[PDB]
Amino acid sequence: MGPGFDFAQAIMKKNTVIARTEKGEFTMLGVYDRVAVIPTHASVGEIIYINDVETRVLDACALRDLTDTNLEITIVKLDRNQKFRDIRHFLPRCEDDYNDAVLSVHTSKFPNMYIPVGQVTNYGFLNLGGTPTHRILMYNFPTRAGQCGGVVTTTGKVIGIHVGGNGAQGFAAMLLHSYFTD
Ligand SMILES: C[C@H]1CCCN(S(C)(=O)=O)[C@@H]1CO
């Protein structure tokens, strides 16, 4: 409808795949080469389905901060025959608050879904499903099961991936440029 949705659509149409694990179907953001991200609660194994194609996992790393606290981001390298558009220049360098964010989802259940979530708070610490978690962003939208892995954008920035909710608020794990230096 506007430039927020325009930037979100541009990311969804080139930089997302549908990932399926034994824990369900997830929006999965491709960042560069064969490297993508997914919430750590997806429990990625040796094999994953990418757009319903059996795909070997070449590497999978559940990120933690230097306090050894969960970040809820898993970085996956996929045995895929095609590279993602490199979007690392749209990643923030620092933890921040944001205005006017969009959460975008693409699964079998929720295709071509875009949610204007509004103001995004650097919330920081969250007890997420019983697990102490750092670098959490919060937005005031009643997100539901099926939205995990959803991409959070502003105009010009890819800032996080949806990892949970409490029925009234939704929570995303930050994406930082420093996670994807090679
Ligand atoms: C292609 C296989 C990879 C290993 C796991 N299995 S399975 C029966 O779902 O456990 C996949 C079958 O589609």
PDB file of C-alpha atoms in Angstrom, residues 3-16 27-32 35-38 73 85-104 114 120 135 137 139 149-162 172-180:
ATOM      1  CA  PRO A   3       6.868   2.315   0.784  1.00  0.00           C
ATOM      2  CA  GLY A   4       7.002   0.140   3.966  1.00  0.00           C
ATOM      3  CA  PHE A   5       5.069  -2.644   2.193  1.00  0.00           C
ATOM      4  CA  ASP A   6       7.138  -2.000  -0.988  1.00  0.00           C
ATOM      5  CA  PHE A   7      10.464  -2.720   0.835  1.00  0.00           C
ATOM      6  CA  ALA A   8       8.930  -5.761   2.654  1.00  0.00           C
ATOM      7  CA  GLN A   9       7.564  -7.208  -0.655  1.00  0.00           C
ATOM      8  CA  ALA A  10      10.985  -6.755  -2.329  1.00  0.00           C
ATOM      9  CA  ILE A  11      12.620  -8.842   0.455  1.00  0.00           C
ATOM     10  CA  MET A  12       9.881 -11.513   0.466  1.00  0.00           C
ATOM     11  CA  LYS A  13       9.849 -12.046  -3.346  1.00  0.00           C
ATOM     12  CA  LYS A  14      13.646 -12.723  -3.636  1.00  0.00           C
ATOM     13  CA  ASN A  15      15.057 -13.541  -0.138  1.00  0.00           C
ATOM     14  CA  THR A  16      12.565 -16.022   1.436  1.00  0.00           C
ATOM     15  CA  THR A  27       9.307 -18.364   6.906  1.00  0.00           C
ATOM     16  CA  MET A  28      13.088 -18.555   6.314  1.00  0.00           C
ATOM     17  CA  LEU A  29      15.143 -15.450   5.341  1.00  0.00           C
ATOM     18  CA  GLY A  30      18.059 -16.027   2.908  1.00  0.00           C
ATOM     19  CA  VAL A  31      20.842 -13.473   3.644  1.00  0.00           C
ATOM     20  CA  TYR A  32      23.670 -14.227   1.105  1.00  0.00           C
ATOM     21  CA  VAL A  35      23.179 -18.850   4.168  1.00  0.00           C
ATOM     22  CA  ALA A  36      19.733 -18.344   5.763  1.00  0.00           C
ATOM     23  CA  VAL A  37      18.259 -17.796   9.247  1.00  0.00           C
ATOM     24  CA  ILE A  38      15.405 -19.452  11.183  1.00  0.00           C
ATOM     25  CA  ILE A  73      18.662 -17.175  15.797  1.00  0.00           C
ATOM     26  CA  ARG A  85      20.609 -12.047  -3.431  1.00  0.00           C
ATOM     27  CA  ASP A  86      23.109 -10.561  -0.934  1.00  0.00           C
ATOM     28  CA  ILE A  87      21.003  -8.319   1.449  1.00  0.00           C
ATOM     29  CA  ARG A  88      23.683  -7.902   4.173  1.00  0.00           C
ATOM     30  CA  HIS A  89      23.874  -4.091   3.456  1.00  0.00           C
ATOM     31  CA  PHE A  90      20.203  -3.825   4.727  1.00  0.00           C
ATOM     32  CA  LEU A  91      21.176  -5.234   8.200  1.00  0.00           C
ATOM     33  CA  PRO A  92      21.615  -2.792  11.131  1.00  0.00           C
ATOM     34  CA  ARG A  93      25.058  -2.622  12.750  1.00  0.00           C
ATOM     35  CA  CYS A  94      23.740  -1.837  16.316  1.00  0.00           C
ATOM     36  CA  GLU A  95      20.813  -2.656  18.693  1.00  0.00           C
ATOM     37  CA  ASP A  96      18.113   0.035  18.167  1.00  0.00           C
ATOM     38  CA  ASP A  97      14.430   1.006  18.362  1.00  0.00           C
ATOM     39  CA  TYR A  98      12.456   1.574  15.100  1.00  0.00           C
ATOM     40  CA  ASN A  99       9.279   3.264  13.826  1.00  0.00           C
ATOM     41  CA  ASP A 100       6.723   1.919  11.340  1.00  0.00           C
ATOM     42  CA  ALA A 101       7.836  -1.759  10.921  1.00  0.00           C
ATOM     43  CA  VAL A 102       6.158  -4.512   8.800  1.00  0.00           C
ATOM     44  CA  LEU A 103       6.161  -8.208   9.715  1.00  0.00           C
ATOM     45  CA  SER A 104       6.008 -10.337   6.493  1.00  0.00           C
ATOM     46  CA  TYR A 114       2.090  -8.412   5.489  1.00  0.00           C
ATOM     47  CA  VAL A 120       9.392  -1.503  17.611  1.00  0.00           C
ATOM     48  CA  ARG A 135      18.402  -8.765  21.903  1.00  0.00           C
ATOM     49  CA  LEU A 137      12.491  -6.448  19.737  1.00  0.00           C
ATOM     50  CA  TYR A 139       5.783  -4.715  18.840  1.00  0.00           C
ATOM     51  CA  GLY A 149      10.451 -16.819  11.093  1.00  0.00           C
ATOM     52  CA  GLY A 150       8.481 -13.843   9.730  1.00  0.00           C
ATOM     53  CA  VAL A 151      10.723 -10.993   8.575  1.00  0.00           C
ATOM     54  CA  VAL A 152      10.607  -7.617  10.363  1.00  0.00           C
ATOM     55  CA  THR A 153      11.567  -4.659   8.119  1.00  0.00           C
ATOM     56  CA  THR A 154      11.460  -0.890   8.035  1.00  0.00           C
ATOM     57  CA  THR A 155      12.029   1.081   4.800  1.00  0.00           C
ATOM     58  CA  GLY A 156      15.650   0.236   3.903  1.00  0.00           C
ATOM     59  CA  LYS A 157      16.364  -2.158   6.845  1.00  0.00           C
ATOM     60  CA  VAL A 158      15.877  -5.878   7.661  1.00  0.00           C
ATOM     61  CA  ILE A 159      15.904  -5.721  11.491  1.00  0.00           C
ATOM     62  CA  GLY A 160      14.716  -9.125  12.879  1.00  0.00           C
ATOM     63  CA  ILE A 161      12.835 -12.438  12.630  1.00  0.00           C
ATOM     64  CA  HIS A 162       9.606 -13.138  14.588  1.00  0.00           C
ATOM     65  CA  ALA A 172      11.533 -10.700  17.195  1.00  0.00           C
ATOM     66  CA  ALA A 173      15.239 -11.643  17.497  1.00  0.00           C
ATOM     67  CA  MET A 174      17.527  -8.864  16.186  1.00  0.00           C
ATOM     68  CA  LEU A 175      19.494  -9.385  13.008  1.00  0.00           C
ATOM     69  CA  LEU A 176      22.874  -7.620  13.136  1.00  0.00           C
ATOM     70  CA  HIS A 177      25.386  -7.216  10.269  1.00  0.00           C
ATOM     71  CA  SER A 178      28.132  -8.776  12.521  1.00  0.00           C
ATOM     72  CA  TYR A 179      26.303 -12.190  12.495  1.00  0.00           C
ATOM     73  CA  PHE A 180      27.047 -12.580   8.703  1.00  0.00           C
TER      74      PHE A 180
END
